[PDB]
Structure formats: C-alpha cells, structure tokens
Design a protein around this ligand. Structure first.
Ligand SMILES: CN1CN([C@@H]2O[C@H](COP(=O)(O)OP(=O)(O)OP(=O)(O)OC[C@H]3O[C@@H](n4cnc5c(=O)[nH]c(N)nc54)[C@H](O)[C@@H]3O)[C@@H](O)[C@H]2O)c2nc(N)[nH]c(=O)c21
Length: 100
C-alpha cells in the first residue's frame, strides 16, 4: 500500500476479499460478529437498516461464506462484485424504484 506499491499500473477490482450481507432490521453488529466468527477478525460497513458490507482476510473465506449462505434462512451473503452486478434492484413496480 502506502509503503510503496499498489500491485501494478492496471485498473482491476480491489474488493475481491469483501462481501455484502442482507438481514432483518432487528440484526445488530454483534449478530454480524457472531455470524462471521468462523473467519477470525473482520471489518463491517453499513449501507442500510437491512444490509451492510463485510471484509474478510482472504478471497477463499469469501468463497466459503458465499457457498455456506445457500443454507441460511434468517440472512443471506454475496460478494461485493455480485452486489455491483445487481445494482439495478427494481425493488417495486407500482410506479417504479423512483417512487418506493
Ligand atoms: C449500529 N447500527 C447502525 N445501523 C445502520 O447503519 C447506519 C450507519 O450507522 P453508523 O455506522 O453507526 O453511523 P452513524 O454514526 O452515522 O449512525 P447514526 O448517528 O445514524 O446512528 C445510528 C442509526 O442506526 C440506527 N440503528 C441502531 N441500531 C439499530 C438496529 O438494531 N436496527 C436498526 N434497524 N437500526 C438501528 C439508529 O436508530 C440510528 O438511526 C445507520 O444509519 C443504520 O441504517 C444498523 N442497522 C442495523 N440493522 N443494526 C445495527 O445495529 C445498526
């Protein structure tokens, strides 16, 4: 990093070790630390009442969390790149996402 290098002059993604997580509005930072305790130390960055980003120390841990979330029924997990690739959310259709 700021020590003297960024990996190269290329413009590839920088979030391959980061997840996006979706949950009921009653979930807390403590439930998130409990969910991701399987991967050691982490970092958490909110974006709504019902979703946040979560950083992990390896992309292998990201792949394991994305595989294991298929069995969850009180939360769900995807990569940062999946969240970006689904940004066209289309949440409601009564008039449009501009109105709900
Ligand atoms: C602790 N939180 C926070 N949030 C959601 O994340 C948003 C950003 O929070 P934060 O990073 O702490 O930044 P701020 O210092 O800017 O926070 P702010 O002064 O707005 O005060 C906190 C807000 O978050 C709400 N909040 C706290 N605890 C809960 C909770 O259990 N559920 C919900 N749904 N909201 C909570 C407060 O009422 C206040 O408005 C933040 O704006 C919010 O969207 C959050 N979301 C969940 N589900 N759980 C949490 O533990 C938190």
């Amino acid at each position: 990093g700021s020590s003297g290098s960024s990996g190269g002059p290329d413009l590839q993604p920088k979030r391959d070790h980061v997840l996006h997580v979706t949950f009921p509005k009653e979930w807390k930072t403590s439930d998130l630390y409990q969910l991701f305790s399987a991967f050691g130390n982490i970092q958490i960055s909110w974006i709504d009442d019902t979703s946040a980003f979560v950083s992990l120390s390896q992309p292998e841990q990201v792949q394991i969390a994305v595989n294991t979330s298929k069995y969850a029924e009180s939360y769900r997990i995807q990569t940062y790149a999946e969240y970006v690739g689904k940004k066209q959310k289309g949440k409601q259709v009564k008039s449009g996402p501009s109105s709900g």
